[PDB]
């Protein structure tokens, strides 16, 4: 089927024109997208979601060069290469992409997000779903392995139940750093007093 192309962090009017002209469409969300187009690595919801699903994450040259050719080119040579940000976050995009393609990062995870977290619960939720985790929109009331709560200092009134039932309280970085590297380390993101 025709590509459903997502963009993040760029206005790429040239690329948008290429998408419709070549017979693809604009993706309305990471979940419906086949391709993410962008120029750099950024921790946006779309970027993390796209990585989580392990879809192609391509530079602006893919659609540009595709349009010169007259058809959607193969993605392989257009992978986003951002050595500066790969260094900044201490990971390899392509390595992280292979990980996502081999396994779902958050398989077996049930994750609740408190209301003051950034990105907000629904958007944090779409990052969780895209990694094969179960987004918990309702407050969990029992302990289960790999059942975690994402919270923050100002959400202490919301930690009341998790705390009673013995659920781990974790920083957003568990997901924001974890999804980006495609490495899940719940032990390292436990919130201290």
């Amino acid at each position: 089927t025709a590509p459903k192309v997502l963009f993040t962090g760029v206005v790429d009017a040239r690329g948008e024109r290429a998408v419709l002209a070549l017979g693809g469409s604009l993706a309305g969300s990471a979940a419906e997208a086949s391709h993410l187009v962008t120029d750099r690595i950024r921790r946006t919801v779309k970027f993390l979601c796209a990585l989580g699903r392990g879809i192609p994450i391509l530079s602006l040259d893919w659609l540009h060069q595709s349009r010169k050719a007259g058809f959607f080119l193969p993605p392989d040579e257009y992978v986003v290469t951002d050595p500066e940000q790969e260094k900044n976050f201490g990971f390899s995009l392509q390595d992280a992409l292979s990980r996502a393609r081999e396994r779902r990062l958050l398989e077996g995870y049930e994750i609740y997000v408190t209301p003051g977290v950034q990105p907000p619960p629904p958007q944090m939720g779409e990052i969780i779903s895209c990694c094969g985790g179960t987004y918990l929109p309702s407050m969990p009331r029992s302990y289960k392995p790999q059942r975690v709560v994402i919270t923050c200092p100002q959400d202490f009134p919301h930690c009341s139940i998790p705390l009673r039932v013995g659920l781990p309280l974790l920083s957003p970085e568990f997901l924001l750093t974890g999804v980006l590297k495609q490495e899940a380390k719940p032990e390292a993101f436990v919130l201290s007093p």
């Binding site: 993040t8 962090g9 950024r42 921790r43 946006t44 919801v45 779309k46 950034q118 990105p119 957003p172 924001l176």
Partner: peptide, 5 residues
Amino acid sequence: ASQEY
């Protein structure tokens, strides 16, 4: 622009 985190 889209929020970065």
